[PDB]
């Protein structure tokens, strides 16, 4: 199907307690493949997926060099943004960046992106045409103007249409065993009794990949969206994910309710009943 490669950069300022904490992680789809930690020992870009470990010292050296330049760019941004916002030098502040690329089933470019935040809210963003910018406020118009004169869209568009999708593709084949797999949800239902006239009914989806999934409860074909408890999809820790949904049934109406699972790994939407 469609695929994506994304890099997340996080830069936190700990004033008078060292240099800014820099963290980078890389993902193909829902699979993390690399990491940098400004605190970690190695001081190299390191592997976090088995299918990326033997890519050569030239891949590992080039990657270490670049993320060390990202480090030093984000250190400078933290100070510049304190300025833009008249903030004290003692304050801890956050900068986040996200960029990457998608492809379709043709493995050809689908879309590219490069968003940016500060203190948890949108700062500036590369527009979907990958040629213009979208500042969230006043202080971000300056930075917008800066990148327009430096021609930073041209440089991003360059990496997003080429090196990005191009390597997304190399990886998809390198770890084609992990990256082109599909684990369909392993489902079941549980029944616990809150009290005497009430019973918790819970539908489970375990060990699925990718994370994208839908779990819906129903009563007589009626969606209980507003009466259901859904939980956020969560890492099991082994490249797969989990998720459940629960409703409360008046002890006896169990047969009225049914759970519906939707996943790209299921040929047909599973329907669970308690019977």
């Amino acid at each position: 199907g469609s695929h994506s490669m994304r890099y997340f950069f996080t830069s936190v300022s700990r004033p008078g307690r060292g240099e800014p904490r820099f963290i980078a992680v890389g993902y193909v789809d829902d699979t993390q493949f690399v990491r940098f930690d400004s605190d970690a020992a190695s001081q190299r870009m390191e592997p976090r997926a088995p299918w990326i470990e033997q890519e050569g010292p030239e891949y590992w050296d080039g990657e270490t060099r670049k993320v060390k330049a990202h480090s030093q760019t984000h250190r400078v941004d933290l100070g510049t943004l304190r300025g833009y916002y008249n903030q004290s030098e003692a304050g801890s502040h956050t900068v986040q960046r996200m960029y990457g690329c998608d492809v379709g089933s043709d493995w050809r470019f689908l879309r590219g992106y490069h968003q940016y935040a500060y203190d948890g809210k949108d700062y500036i963003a590369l527009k979907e045409d990958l040629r213009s910018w979208t500042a969230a406020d006043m202080a971000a118009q300056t930075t917008k103007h800066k990148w327009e004169a430096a021609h930073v869209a041209e440089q991003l568009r360059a990496y997003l249409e080429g090196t990005c999708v191009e390597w997304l593709r190399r990886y998809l084949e390198n770890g084609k065993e992990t990256l082109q797999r599909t684990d369909a949800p392993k489902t079941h239902m549980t029944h616990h009794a809150v009290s005497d006239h009430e019973a918790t009914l819970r539908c489970w989806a375990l060990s699925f990949y990718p994370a994208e999934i839908t779990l819906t409860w129903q009563r007589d074909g009626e969606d209980q969206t507003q009466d259901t408890e859904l939980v956020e999809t969560r890492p099991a820790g082994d490249g797969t994910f989990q998720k459940w949904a629960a409703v409360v049934v008046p002890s006896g109406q169990e047969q009225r309710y049914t759970c519906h699972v939707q996943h790209e790994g299921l040929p047909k939407p599973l329907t669970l009943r308690w019977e």
Binding site: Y7, Y59, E63, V76, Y116, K146
Partner: peptide, 9 residues
């Protein structure tokens, strides 16, 4: 593979 190539906000 990540970005080159420089930057600077």
């Amino acid at each position: 593979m990540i970005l080159g190539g420089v930057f600077x906000v």
